[PDB]
Design a protein around this ligand. Structure first.
Ligand code: SF4
Lengths: 277, 280
């Protein structure tokens, strides 16, 4: 609640391996480039892959890695917070040490460390937490339990597991809507190019009582830009996919429809995936 | 103590990254044991992100222990509801996922097993018991089976992708951490070949550096997807095809394996050197 005062705090949730981090970074870059917003990304994926395209290839040191190797007194803002494309601030929480420790404890510690270092600037326009939603356990769903960000967006695709993951995240949102003021702002579709995928999403959003903030199409220029360790925005701000991310970024920034979702049961979800084939 | 469970059986945990066919291999290995060697086999799913028993139950989704426990109560959880019988009498149980925002996925697996034990759901005459465990992130939760001694004999499924080998190394780190405390050991690496290529040599060296061995090289074969499309294992779909014999060989090797080690996980440099020498 006391982090980045006049900034839109947003958490981007979603299953892994569906391009969630690519959409988060390109959305962040779209805001800074097209609308001149001061943006900050705090990664919360154990892979620590939420800022590589903003910092250009170099995998940034994670907060939990630095803290493990050094300790509280040694950590500095210069080491864990990096500036990248369009002066976007980048921080990575990092994953747990194999065999011990919870993902959520790592993200709490990283946010706390950023708090103590005064690393979230007061003039921030947009702060994004990129969080993994394969499993809504106490660790990965801690942001929902504590309202780390009140405005949630779920990334999904026209795939069974990706819809399953999305629905279970909506359950976590519904669960903590009153306790932490958490809300669902909408759904982001990273297209898999499935026949009737846009209709599948429209319906999925209607059942959840939410909306599709944007349909992000599949485009080869994405893999092109990432091969250059770049966002599509920086690689070519004029290409159609860049405008697609711009519309996404603008819809998020302008969104005011923050709802308590109505997750579907497993039976309705079975019907929906059986009916879109 | 968990050494109570299935005392006459070879108790085995299978860890691995998702999206690499770990559950496919576990179920086909189980199907081979029961089909070819008349083994009494049981699978306990410990992957909340992966179906570990669908191929044995012909596509019939199974009520998970944790779902029945949370939404119905302790009384409701009964062997009939959570323990199912499929191909060649292979017993099936699914731990389930966590309560959103509170439950620990790894602790729930331990709760699932504990409940199964209280319901005498692990037959004494079991020949082989399989825990199909998620190995995407080696957090304390999913390292519980290793620190609790659910199975002292661990197997790691990987493939030729960096992230699969990376995840495999991290699992080896989790085994080593509790190897002294829990007696947990690594019995071998299972490679689900992504393609018909030189993956075997890459795996032979990977195992060498980890201080372990390749218990089998599961070739890539489209018959897996055709069998999955029919909601079956390859064993049930076509027990005479070569891929069925590959699982047969893997099943036999796991069953009689007595070469267990404390792994030597690779350094980050070693992993990069292996990647360079064999291609990105
Ligand atoms: S709550 Fe989740 S991230 Fe934390 S230890 Fe348990 S399974 Fe792992």
């Amino acid at each position: 609640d006391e982090i980045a005062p006049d900034a839109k705090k947003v958490a981007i949730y979603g299953k892994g391996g569906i391009g969630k981090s690519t959409t988060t970074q390109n959305t962040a870059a779209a805001l800074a480039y097209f609308f001149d917003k001061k943006v900050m990304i705090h990664g919360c994926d154990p892979k620590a892959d939420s800022t590589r395209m903003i910092l250009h290839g170099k995998p940034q040191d994670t907060v939990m890695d630095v803290l493990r190797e050094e300790g509280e007194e040694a950590v500095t803002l210069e080491k864990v917070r990096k500036i990248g494309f369009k002066d976007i601030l980048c921080v990575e929480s990092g994953g747990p040490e194999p065999g011990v420790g919870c993902a959520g404890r790592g993200v709490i510690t990283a946010v706390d460390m950023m708090r103590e270092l005064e690393g979230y600037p007061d003039d921030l326009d947009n702060l994004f937490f990129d969080v993994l939603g394969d499993v809504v356990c106490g660790g990965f769903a801690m942001p929902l339990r504590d309202g780390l960000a009140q405005e949630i967006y779920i990334v999904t695709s026209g795939e069974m597991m990706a819809l399953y993951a999305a629905n279970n995240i909506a359950k976590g949102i519904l669960k903590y809507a009153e306790q932490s003021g958490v809300r669902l702002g909408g759904i982001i579709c990273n297209a898999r190019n499935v026949d009737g995928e846009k209709e599948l999403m429209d319906e999925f959003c209607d059942k959840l009582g939410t909306k599709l903030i944007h349909y992000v199409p599949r485009d080869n220029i994405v893999q092109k830009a990432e091969f250059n360790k770049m966002t599509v925005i920086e690689f070519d701000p004029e290409c159609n996919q860049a405008k697609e991310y711009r519309t996404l970024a603008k819809n998020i920034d302008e969104n005011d429809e923050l709802v308590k979702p109505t997750p579907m049961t497993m039976d309705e979800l079975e019907e929906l995936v059986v009916k879109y084939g």
